[model samples]
Target: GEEAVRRRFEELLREALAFRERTGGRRETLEHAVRLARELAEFAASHPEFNRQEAVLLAIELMVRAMGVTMETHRSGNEVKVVIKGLNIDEQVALYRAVRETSKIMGVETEIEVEGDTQTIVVRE
Candidate 1:
């Protein structure tokens, strides 16, 4: 069942990837992919057949699949700039706010600065 669920999640990810390609690397499709990943994470939490280690491994895999592209695009010298491209001003703000909140919960200190059309987030130890 875990494998089947993983396969389904992978298929959804592939569709999300296709959407991104079709949209010329648009960020909207990538956002959808991230949302789908969160949904899959919730589902994974309900699957008791999977052991703790397996669930953690699967969650990490999903996180990589969902955030890998955006994360890669934001790499800078000693800092990461997650670019929420193609998002409107409000959505961009919300995304950054959510990131800051989540990072804080994860014991990370974050600095987020926004310019005219770009937001830069820096995470440090």
Candidate 2:
């Protein structure tokens, strides 16, 4: 409880002191791009997951909000593919696990392939 309270204060400080750029090209720190480079790990852990279905969209959108990355979700044969780039090591792994675990729970086939900083997440039901 105390640690959570402290992190909330820390989030407040970061929100006030850090200016990040949204995907809309505006700069501000309500979980924007420039600042998430420092906050991603904490954020990945802090997020509360309630609905598995909704997490699929968020798992990708968070990447965009965190950085100026390109993500493309498309149909590849019988499966869906999410192609992404421009994220660092931790962000890659965080999303890699998130998508995998969520998809697995939904009884979907999920695969993540990573080479350097790029990650490709594929889902098949």
Candidate 1's displacement at residue 124, Å, is 19
lDDT of 1 at 123: 58
TM-score (all chains, Cα) for each model: 0.43, 0.50
Model 2, which residues run further than 4 Å from truth?
1-58
Residue 26 CA displacement from its true place in model 1, Å: 3.4
- Flag clash pairs in model 1: none
What's the number of clashes in each of the models? Answer: 0, 0
lDDT of 1 by residue, 94-116 (tens): 45644544443333466776665
lDDT of 1: 0.50
Could you tell me the TM-score of candidate 2? 0.50
Cα shift from native, residue 86, model 2 (Å):
0.5
Tens digit of per-residue lDDT, candidate 2, span 50-123 = 33333344445554444546788887576677888886666566556556554544445677899987888876
